[PDB]
C-alpha cells in the first residue's frame, strides 16, 4: 500500500493535468479560428 | 474503485476533441452564432452535443494518448471549418441574393443592409421547420464515421477549388428575373430621355426601381423561392466526396 | 527497495517480542521509514501544484 | 448515508450548468437578445439585467417542478435495504423532471440519439427503434437534453422571426421614401430608429409577449 | 369482428414483451423479460398447449435463458449469464443441495459443479439464480 | 443570529443584481446611452462614466428606502417566541420596498403574476419585480423616443439644403454633427433632463 | 521538463498572429477581396466566405511544416553535456520552417535587420514582400474589368444615352461574364500552384 | 393486505433472502398465519426448520416480511 | 433435412442457429463478433463441425457444462500460481470429478509441487486461478 498508493498518486494527478491541458488547447485552438474569421 | 473515476475521466478528455470538431459550426450557422446566443449557456450546449454524438464507446480509453496533439487540433479545426462552410451553403446564397436585389435598386451606392438580412432569416426559418436539425446533426454523425482521428483525414483539396463559383452560379440564376426587368426598364426610360433631353431621368430611376424590385419578386416569392431552399441543403450522402483519410 | 529491508526485520520480533536490542533497531528502522514516506508524498505534491499553476496562469 | 451528502454536494456544484442547459431559460434568453437586435440597439438595455428578467420568469415556471424534489428527497425513508430498490428510488424521484423533458422535446430529434448511441454502444448490428416505443418505453436522461436544447433553439428562433418582421417592413419603406427623393447619400437607420421604437411602445410588446411565454407552459384559472 | 375458427396468437412485429405476456395465461405465472432481451422481434402464427415445452424450444432457437422460481418466470438473453466461485468453511455441498432440493429452487439444467464433500463449488446461470445462491451460501457460514 | 448572518451576507453578494433589476438605475442607465446614440456618437464619453453618474443619481432617491430598513431592524424585539410572529416581523420590514414597487408597476400585470383589495394584503415580492423592470424599460423607451425626435429635424434640414443645391454626393454626417450638439448645449439639455428625471420620483 | 510546457502552450496563444503575419494567409486574403472590389459589390461573396476558404488553403501549406516540426522534436535525445549543443538542436527543428521563409523573402531587408540567419529578421521582410507580390497580381486581374466598363459607357455615348448612370448597367455585365468564364475557380487554383504542388 | 389492494406491473417484482439468527421459519410463518398477511400465491421458500429462506413478490410485501423478520430477531 | 443457409452473417446470428443442435446456448464475444461468413452448412455432426470451424476461422471455445463460450484466439491469457499446502494431484482430481477438466487445455506443471502454469480462454483461467487460491485459504 505505501508503494501502490504512491504509484496511484502520480497516476491520478498526471492524467488530471493531461485532461486540463487537452481542454485548454482546444479552447485556444478554436478561439484562434474565431478571431481569424473576424480577421 | 478506481475505474469509476476513470470512466468520467476518459469522457471529459474525449469531449475536448468533440468540442474541437463541432465548435466552428456554432459560429457559422445563422440561428446558432454568438449574435443570437449568449456566453453563459453556449458552452454547456456545445459539450453535451458532442457527447451525444461521439463515435467511440465512452468507458474505453481514447486513442489520443501522446500521438501528435497540437497538429491534431489543427486537423479537427480544419475539418470543422470545412463542415461549417458546407452547412452554411443555402444561407450564404440566400444572403447573396438579397445583396444583389438591394444593390440593383440603388440604396447601397453610399459605398463608392436589412433586405439581405430578411431573406437570410427567412431561409433560416423555412429550413428549420421541416426536418432541419435532424439533418444538421446527421452530417456530423457521419463525419465521425468517415473521419475518425488518428487517421489524419483532410478536406480533399481538388473539389474545394470550385466552391466559390458553386455558390456563384446558384446566386446569379436565383437573381435572374428581377435584374432583367430593372435593366429593361432603365433603357426604356433612357429612350425617353433621348426623346426629351432635359428630363434628368436619373432622378426618376430611383423613384421607380424600388417599386419594381419588390413587385416583380412578389410574383415568384411564394411558389418558387422556398423549394430551392430545401434543394440546396447539403445532405449526408455526399460526405464521402469531400473527405478522405490518410492512412 | 527500502520496504524489503523494512519487511525483513518484523518477523524476528514477531517470533521474539521481548528482545531489547531488536525493538531498538526496529524503532530505528520504522521512524526513518516514517521520515521517508511523507517526504516522498510532500515532494511529489509540489511538482503537481507548480505544474497546475502554469495552466492556471495561461487559461 | 455519509456519501449521500457527497452526492448532494456534487449535485450542488453542477447546478447552474443544468440551469444553462436543462430548463426553459434558453427560450427566454434567446428571444430577449433577438428583441434587442431587431430594434437595432446594440448595448442597451444592458443585458446583465436582461439575464435577470429572463431568469425570474423561468424560475417562476420551474418552481412547482423542483419543489416536489425536496419533499420527495427529504423523506426519512430514503435508505432502503436492497441495492436495486435504492437505485429504483432515484428513478421514480427523477420521473417528474423526465416527463417534463418528454412533453416539450421533439419526437424525432430525441429518437435520433438512441439509434446514434446504440451503434456506438454495441455496433452496427443493433436494429433501429421506431416511433412505436413511445407508448411504453422511456429514454435515458442523457439522450434527452441535447435534443431538448436543440428543439428549444428551434422554437425560440421560430418566435424570433415573427417579431423581426414588423420592423423590416418599416426599414424598407424608409429606404424607399429617401430614394423617392434624391437623398441617396444618407444613412436611413437614423431616421428609422424613432419609428422603430414607436412601433414597439405603442404596440406594448413587452407586456403581452411576457404573458405569451407563460401561456406557452402554464394556464390561467 | 375477429374471424378465425381455432385458437392461437398471431404476432405482427411483436417485441418479445407483448409476446410472452400473451403466453402468461397458458403459463399460470407472470413473465418478467429483461431489458436487453426485449429488443428482439418475432412474427408469425403461434399456439400454446404445453408452454413449458414450448418455452424451452424457443429459448434455444432465439437464444435465451429462463428460470422459474415458483412465483414468476424470468427471461434473459444469452449474453447476460454470470459465473461465481465460493468457499464454505464449515458446511458441505451435499448439505447445501439438500436445502435447494427441499426448498424447491433446485434447477437440473443449471446444477452446481463441485466436489461432493468440500467447501468450494462453481455456480453459473441466470442473474437472478446466481445472486441468490451466493447470498444463501454466505448467509449459512455466518449463521453456523 | 447565526442564520441572520447568512441573510445579511446574502443581500450583499446579491446587491449588484437587485440594483441591476429592481430600481430606477435601469431607466437612468438606458436614457444616458440613447442620448449618445441620438447625437451620433459611439464611444464618447464612455460606458463607465455614464454608469457612474447614473449610479449616484439613482442612489439619491433610493437611499431613504435602504436607510429605514436599518433603523427598523436595529430594534430590540427581534427575539420572538413564535415562528410566525418573526415571519410577520420580516414581512413588516419589506413594506418600504413593496410600497415603492406598487407605485411604478402595473396592477394588471402583477395580477397576472399573482394568478400563477391590496389594502388587506400586499402582493408577494417575487410577483412584481419583473413587472417593475418590464414597466421601466417600456417607459424609458417611450421617453427615449421623445428626446430622439428634435435631432431628426436637424438631420433632415441640412440634407435638404444640400440637395437644394446640386451637391448630392456629399455625406451630411460631417456637417450635421456640429449642428447636432449646439442644439444640445444651447438648450443646456443635460442639466435639465437630470432635473426632471429626479422630479419624476422625488418631489421638490 | 515543465519548461517545455510553457513554450508548447505559448505557441497556441501566439498562433493567431503567426497566421496573421508569417504565412501565405497574407497573400491569400488580399487578392480575393481586391477582385471583389473589382466587381463593385462589397457583400458578395460575403467576406466570411473569403476568410473561410483562404484559411483552409493557407492551412494546406503550413500543415506539412507543422508535422515536420514535431516529427523531429519527438526524438527525446536532445539532452547533452554542453548548453549550446542542446541549443543547436532546437535550431535544427526550426530550419524546416525557416527554409519556407528564406525562399520567398528578398536579400535586402534580411541583412538590414541583422546588423541593426536570424529568424526575427525575416517575418517583416516576408509580409512586406507578400503585399508587394499581391498588388501586381491584383493589377493584372484589374485591367479586364477596366476595359469592359469602358466599352459599355462608350456605347451610351455612341447613342444619345449620355445622362444615365453607367454603373447600374455595367455591374451585372461585369459579374455575369466573369462567372461565365468560371474565374473564381481559376484565380484560386492559379494561386495555390505557386506555393505547393496542388492535387 | 386487508385494507387496500395494491397493483404493480410485472417488472417491479423484487426478491430477497434473509437470515433469522434465533427464530425458526415455522414460527414466523405461524405469526403470519395468525396475523392475516399470509399470501398463498407468493409463499416463503426455504427449509422447514432453519433460519434462511427465500421470499419474492410485490415491494410492499417484501419490505414487510424483511422488516418484520429483522424486528423479530432484535426482540429475541 | 436440416441446415443453415448463411448469406453474410456476423458470427453471432450464425452460432445461435447451431444452439439447438448443440444442446447448450452459445455466447460469442464482441471481438469475435466482427467476422462474417457465407455458405450452405449442414448440422449433422456439430461437435466436429464446431471444432473444424474454430481452427479454420481461428477461435477458441470452452464448454463448462451449461453453455459454450466462444472467444477469438487473440484473447488467450496465462498465469502461474503456487499452492502452499496442497499439491497438483488433488486439484486435478477435483477437476476430474467436478467436470471442469478440459483435455484440450490441461494444466502444465510438476506432479508434486505448488507451482504450475495455465493458459486458455478468459473464463477458464479466471476460474482456475480463483479456485486455486480459494483452497489454500481454507487450508
Inter-residue contact B17 to B54 (CB < 8 Å): no
- What's the DSSP call for residue G27? H
Longest Cα–Cα distance in chain C = 61
Contacts of E26 by beta carbon, 8 Å cutoff, 6+ apart: E48, E49, E51
Choose the closest CB to A24 out of C3, C44, C59: C59
Crossing angle, helix G25-39 and helix G50-73, to 10 degrees?
Answer: 170
CA distance F44 to F50: 10
E103-to-C10, E97, G27, H55 alpha-carbon distances in Å: 51, 10, 87, 11
* Minimal CA separation from D147 to chain B, in Å: 8
Contact D122, I31 (CB under 8 A): no
Alpha-carbon gap, residue F107 to F111, rounded angstroms: 6
Instruction: Please give the full DSSP string across H47-75, using - where no structure is assigned.
Output: -SSSSEEEEEE-HHHHHHHHHHHHHHHTT
Cα distance between residue F49 and residue F52, in whole Å:
5
Contact B119, B98 (CB under 8 A): yes
B110 neighbors B102 (Cβ within 8 angstroms)? no
Measuring CA to CA, how many Å separate I106 from each of D185, I67, I92, I95, I99? 96, 20, 9, 10, 13
Q: Going by C-beta distance under 8 Å and a sequence separation of 6 or more, which residues neighbour residue H67?
A: D81
What are the residues facing H46 on neighbouring strands?
H53
Please provide the DSSP assignment of B134-195 as one string.
Answer: HHHHHHHHHHHHH--SSS-EE--STTTTTHHHHHHHHHHTTTHHHHHHHHHHHHHHHHHHHH
Q: Which of F157, F147, F160, F194 is nearest to F179 (CA)?
A: F157
Residue F29's nearest CA partner among F7, F9, F52, F13 is: F52
Question: D85 in contact with H at a CB cutoff of 8 Å?
Answer: yes
- CA-to-CA separations, B76 to B16, B148, G7, in angstroms, rounded: 11, 10, 22
**C-alpha neighbours within 13 Å on the C-beta side of residue I58:** 9
Parallel/antiparallel/unpaired status of strands I60-63 and I68-71: antiparallel
Residues 115-134 of D with CB under 8 A from I: 122-123, 125
**CB neighbour list of residue F91: distance below 8 Å, 6 or more residues apart:** none
Residue of A38, D171, D174 whose CA lies nearest to B116: D171
Chain breaks in chain I (C to N over 2.5 A) after: none
For chain D, give the number of residues. Answer: 221
> Structural domain of residue C58, as residue ranges?
1-59
Strands of the sheet with E31-33, listed across from one edge:
E31-33, E73-77, E64-68
Domain count for chain C: 1
- Give CA torsion, residues I88, I93, I99, I102, to 10 deg: 40
Cβ atoms within 10 A of the Cβ of I105, count?
17
Q: What is the rounded CA–CA span in Å between residue I75 and residue I61?
A: 11
Say how far apart CA G121 and CA G112 lie, in whole Å: 8
Give the phi and the psi of residue I115 in degrees, each rounded to 5: -90, 130
C-alpha D104/C-alpha F62 separation (Å) is: 42
Residue with cell string 462453481: E122
CB within 8 Å of G94: residues ≥ 6 apart: G69, G119
Nearest to F102 by CA among F110, F94, F92: F110
CA distances from I18 to E77, I6, I21, I49, I101 (A): 16, 12, 6, 10, 24
- Spatial neighbors of G50 by CB under 8 A, at least 6 apart, are G29, G32, G33, G36
Q: How far apart are CA F9 and CA F21, in angstroms?
A: 19
Coil vs helix vs strand at F203: coil
Q: How far is CA B108 from CA D178, D188, F174, in A?
A: 12, 11, 19
- First vs last Cα of chain B: how many Å apart? 38
Of H13, H19, H52, the CB nearest to E32: H13
A vs C: CB pairs below 8 A: 23
Residue B202: count other Cβ atoms within 10 Å of its Cβ: 16
Q: Give E114's strand partners.
A: E121
Helix (DSSP H) and strand (DSSP E) numbers for chain I: 4, 8
CA distance linking residue C30 with residue C14, whole number of Å:
15
CA separation for the pair E97, E105 (Å, rounded): 10
8-state DSSP, F200: T
User: What residues of H are in contact with residue D80 (Cβ under 8 Å)?
Assistant: 63
Backbone dihedral region of B33: left (phi > 0), alpha (psi from -120 to 50 degrees) or beta? beta
A24 shares contact with chain G (CB less than 8 Å): yes
Side by side, the strands of the sheet bearing I108-109 are I77-82, I115-120, I108-109
Pairing relationship of beta strands I68-71 and I26-28 according to DSSP bridges: parallel
Q: Which residues contact C9 (CB under 8 A, 6 or more apart)?
A: C22, C25, C26, C29
Nearest-CA distance G187 → chain B (Å): 10
What is the 3 state secondary structure string of E40-73?
A: CCEEEEECCCCHHHHHHHHHHHCCEEEEECCCCE
Return residues 16-55 of I near D (CB < 8 Å): 30, 33-34
Judged by 3 or more CB pairs under 8 A, whether F touches H is: no
Q: Which three cell numbers stand for residue D31?
A: 428571444
Cα F120–F124–F130 angle (5° rounding)?
Answer: 135
Contact E137, E96 (CB under 8 A): yes
Crossing angle for the helix pair F107-115 and D206-215, nearest 10 degrees? Answer: 10
Polymer length in residues for chain A: 39
Judge contact between D48 and F20, C-beta under 8 A.
yes
| Chain gaps in chain F, named by the residue before each (C–N > 2.5 Å) | 116
Quick one: cell of D4? 449521500
Residues in chain B with CB shorter than 8 Å from the CB of D179 are 105-107, 206-207, 210
- C-alpha–C-alpha distance, residues B59 and B5, integer Å: 11
The continuous run of DSSP H or E covering F153 comes out as helix F129-164
Nearest-angstrom CA–CA distance, C14 and E78? 53
Q: Say if CB C33 and CB C40 are below 8 A apart.
A: no
Q: Are C13 and C23 in contact (CB under 8 A)?
A: yes
Diameter of chain B by CA atoms? 95
Could you give the CA distance from residue I115 to residue E102 in angstroms, rounded to a whole number?
41
Strands (E), I11-95: 26-28, 37-40, 60-63, 68-71, 77-82
Q: Please indicate whether chains C and H are in contact, defined as at least 3 beta carbon pairs under 8 Å.
A: no
Instruction: Sheet containing I68-71: give its strands across.
Output: I26-28, I68-71, I60-63
Going by C-alpha positions, the residue among H18, H2, H7 that lies closest to residue H58 is: H7
Experimental method: cryo-EM
- For D168: left if phi > 0, alpha if psi spans -120 to 50, otherwise beta; the answer is alpha
Q: Which residues lie closer than 8 Å to I76 by C-beta, 6 or more apart?
A: I60, I119, I120, I121, I122
Partner residue opposite A29 with nearest CB, options B2, B12, B77: B77
Closest approach of G15 to chain B, Cα-based (Å): 11
Three cell numbers written together for D68: 416536489
Using DSSP, state whether G193 is helix, strand or coil: helix
Residues in chain B: 247
Query: How many contacts does A have with G, using Cβ atoms within 8 A?
Result: 27
Size of interface E-I (CB pairs under 8 A): 66
Question: How is residue G106 written as a grid cell?
Answer: 528578398
How far, in Å, CA of B40 to CA of B36, rounded? 13
Name the residue among E88, E75, E64 with its Cα closest to residue E20.
Answer: E75
Grid coordinates 423616443 are at which residue? F145
Nearest to B157 by CA among G63, G137, H68: G63
E34 close to E71: Cβ distance less than 8 angstroms:
no
Q: Is F86 helix (H, G, I), strand (E, B) or coil?
A: helix
Please name the residues in contact with B15: beta carbons below 8 A apart, sequence gap of 6 or more. B47, B50, B51, B54
Kindly list the distances between the CA atom of residue E94 and the CA atoms of E123, E139, I98, in Å, as whole numbers in the listed order.
Answer: 14, 16, 13
Q: Which residues contact E19 (CB under 8 A, 6 or more apart)?
A: E9, E11, E42
Which letter, b or e, does each residue of F1-22 get, where b requires 16 or more Cβ atoms within 10 Å of its Cβ? eeeeeeeeeeeeeeeeeebbbb
What is the distance between the alpha carbons of residues B93 and B164, in angstroms, rounded to a whole number?
11
Strands I77-82 and B153-154: unpaired
User: Cα(B74)–Cα(F98) distance, rounded to whole angstroms?
Assistant: 57
Contacts of C47 (CB under 8 A, 6+ apart): none
Q: Do H14 and D81 touch (CB under 8 A)?
A: no
Report the alpha-carbon distance of residue B10 to residue A22 in Å, rounded. 12
Angle in degrees, 0-180, between the axes of helices B69-87 and B89-104, rounded to the nearest 10: 50
Q: Which residues of I touch D122 (CB under 8 A)?
A: 30
Cβ-based neighbours of G169, under 8 Å, separated by 6 or more: B183, B186, B187, G152
Nearest CA in chain B to G8: B70
Dump the DSSP string for B84-145: HHHHTHHHHHHHHHHHHHHHHTSS-TT----HHHHHHHHHHHHHHHSS-HHHHHHHHHHHHH
**From the CB of residue E85, how many other CB atoms can be counted at a distance below 10 Å?**
20
Under a CB-based contact definition with an 8 Å cutoff, are residues B199 and B193 in contact?
yes
d(CA F101, CA F98): 5
- D12, three cell numbers: 450542488
Report the first-to-last Cα separation within chain C, whole angstroms: 40
Q: The cell 518484523 sits on which residue?
A: C10
Chosen from E115, E119, E130, E137 to mutate, greatest number of chain I CBs within 10 A: E115
| Residue G56 sits at the chain C interface (C-beta within 8 Å) | no
Residues in CB range of G9: below 8 A, 6 or more apart = A24, A25, C54, C55, C58
Pairing of strands B244-245, I60-63: unpaired
- CA B124, CA B32: separation in Å to the nearest integer? 11
DSSP assignment of D3-38 equals HHHHHHHHHHHTHHHHHHHTSTHHHHHHHHHHHHHH
Q: Which three cell numbers stand for residue E89?
A: 468453511
Cβ pair B47, B17 in contact under 8 A: no
Amino acid at each position: 500500500d505505501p508503494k501502490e498508493l504512491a504509484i496511484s498518486q502520480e497516476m491520478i494527478s498526471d492524467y488530471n493535468l493531461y485532461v486540463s491541458m487537452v481542454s485548454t488547447l482546444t479552447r485556444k485552438g478554436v478561439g484562434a479560428v474565431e478571431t481569424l474569421l473576424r480577421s | 474503485f478506481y475505474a469509476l473515476y476513470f470512466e468520467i475521466h476518459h469522457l471529459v478528455a474525449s469531449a475536448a476533441l468533440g468540442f474541437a470538431r463541432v465548435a466552428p459550426i456554432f459560429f457559422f450557422l445563422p440561428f446558432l452564432n454568438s449574435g443570437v446566443l449568449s456566453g453563459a449557456p453556449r458552452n454547456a450546449i456545445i459539450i453535451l452535443v458532442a457527447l451525444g454524438v461521439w463515435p467511440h464507446a465512452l468507458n474505453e480509453a481514447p486513442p489520443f494518448l501522446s500521438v501528435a496533439m497540437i497538429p491534431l487540433v489543427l486537423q479537427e479545426a480544419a475539418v470543422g471549418v470545412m463542415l461549417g462552410c458546407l452547412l452554411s451553403w443555402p444561407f450564404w446564397v440566400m444572403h447573396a441574393l438579397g445583396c444583389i436585389i438591394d444593390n440593383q435598386r440603388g440604396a447601397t451606392l453610399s459605398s463608392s443592409s436589412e433586405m439581405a438580412n430578411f431573406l437570410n432569416m427567412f431561409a433560416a426559418v423555412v429550413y428549420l421547420q421541416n426536418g432541419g436539425l435532424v439533418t444538421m446533426v446527421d452530417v456530423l454523425n457521419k463525419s465521425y464515421q468517415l473521419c475518425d482521428p488518428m487517421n489524419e483525414c483532410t478536406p480533399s483539396l481538388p473539389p474545394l477549388l470550385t466552391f466559390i463559383n458553386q455558390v456563384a452560379q446558384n446566386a446569379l440564376v436565383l437573381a435572374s428575373p428581377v435584374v432583367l426587368v430593372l435593366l429593361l426598364s432603365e433603357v426604356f426610360l433612357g429612350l425617353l430621355s433621348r426623346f426629351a433631353p432635359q428630363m434628368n431621368a436619373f432622378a426618376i430611376s430611383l423613384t421607380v426601381k424600388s417599386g419594381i424590385a419588390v413587385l416583380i419578386m412578389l410574383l415568384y416569392f411564394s411558389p418558387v423561392l422556398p423549394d430551392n431552399v430545401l434543394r440546396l441543403s447539403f445532405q449526408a450522402t455526399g460526405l464521402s466526396s469531400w473527405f478522405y483519410e490518410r492512412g | 527497495n527500502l520496504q524489503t529491508q523494512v519487511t525483513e526485520a518484523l518477523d524476528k520480533l514477531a517470533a521474539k517480542p521481548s528482545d531489547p536490542a531488536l525493538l531498538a533497531a526496529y524503532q530505528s528502522k520504522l521512524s526513518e521509514y516514517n521520515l521517508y514516506r511523507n517526504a516522498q508524498s510532500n515532494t511529489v505534491k509540489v511538482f503537481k501544484d507548480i505544474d497546475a499553476a502554469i495552466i492556471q496562469n495561461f487559461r | 448515508n455519509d456519501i449521500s451528502l457527497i452526492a448532494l454536494l456534487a449535485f450542488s456544484t453542477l447546478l447552474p450548468f443544468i440551469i444553462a442547459s436543462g430548463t426553459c431559460f434558453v427560450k427566454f434568453s434567446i428571444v430577449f437578445v433577438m428583441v434587442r437586435n431587431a430594434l437595432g440597439l446594440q448595448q442597451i438595455p444592458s443585458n446583465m439585467t436582461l439575464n435577470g428578467v429572463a431568469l425570474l420568469l423561468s424560475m417562476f415556471v420551474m418552481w412547482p417542478i423542483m419543489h416536489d424534489a425536496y419533499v420527495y428527497f427529504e423523506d426519512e425513508d430514503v435508505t432502503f435495504n436492497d441495492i436495486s430498490s435504492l437505485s429504483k428510488h432515484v428513478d421514480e424521484g427523477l420521473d417528474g423532471y423526465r416527463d417534463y423533458l418528454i412533453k416539450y422535446s421533439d419526437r424525432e430529434l430525441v429518437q435520433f440519439f438512441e439509434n446514434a448511441q446504440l451503434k456506438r454502444q454495441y455496433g452496427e448490428e443493433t436494429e433501429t427503434v421506431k416511433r412505436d416505443k413511445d407508448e411504453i418505453e422511456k429514454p435515458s436522461i442523457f439522450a434527452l437534453l441535447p435534443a431538448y436544447a436543440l428543439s428549444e433553439i428551434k422554437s425560440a428562433f421560430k418566435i424570433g422571426f415573427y417579431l423581426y418582421l414588423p420592423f423590416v417592413v418599416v426599414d424598407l419603406v424608409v429606404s424607399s421614401v429617401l430614394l423617392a427623393l434624391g437623398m441617396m447619400m444618407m444613412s436611413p437607420v437614423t431616421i428609422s430608429t424613432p419609428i422603430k421604437l414607436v412601433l414597439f411602445v405603442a404596440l406594448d410588446g413587452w407586456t403581452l409577449l411576457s404573458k405569451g411565454l407563460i401561456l406557452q407552459y402554464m394556464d390561467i384559472a | 369482428k375477429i374471424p378465425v375458427t381455432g385458437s392461437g396468437f398471431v404476432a405482427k412485429d411483436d417485441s418479445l414483451r407483448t409476446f410472452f405476456d400473451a403466453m402468461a395465461l397458458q403459463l399460470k405465472e407472470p413473465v418478467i423479460v429483461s431489458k436487453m432481451a426485449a429488443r428482439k422481434k418475432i412474427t408469425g402464427n403461434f399456439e400454446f398447449h404445453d408452454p413449458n415445452a414450448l418455452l424451452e424450444k424457443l429459448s434455444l432457437q432465439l437464444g435465451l435463458i429462463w428460470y422459474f422460481d415458483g412465483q414468476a418466470i424470468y427471461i434473459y438473453d444469452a449474453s447476460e449469464m454470470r459465473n461465481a466461485v465460493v468457499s464454505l468453511r464449515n458446511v458441505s455441498l451435499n448439505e447445501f443441495n439438500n436445502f435447494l432440493k427441499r426448498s424447491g429452487l433446485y434447477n437440473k439444467n443449471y446444477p452446481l459443479r463441485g466436489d461432493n464433500r468440500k467447501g468450494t463449488f462453481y455456480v453459473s446461470g441466470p442473474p437472478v439464480y446466481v445472486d441468490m445462491v451466493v447470498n444463501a451460501a454466505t448467509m449459512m457460514d455466518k449463521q453456523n
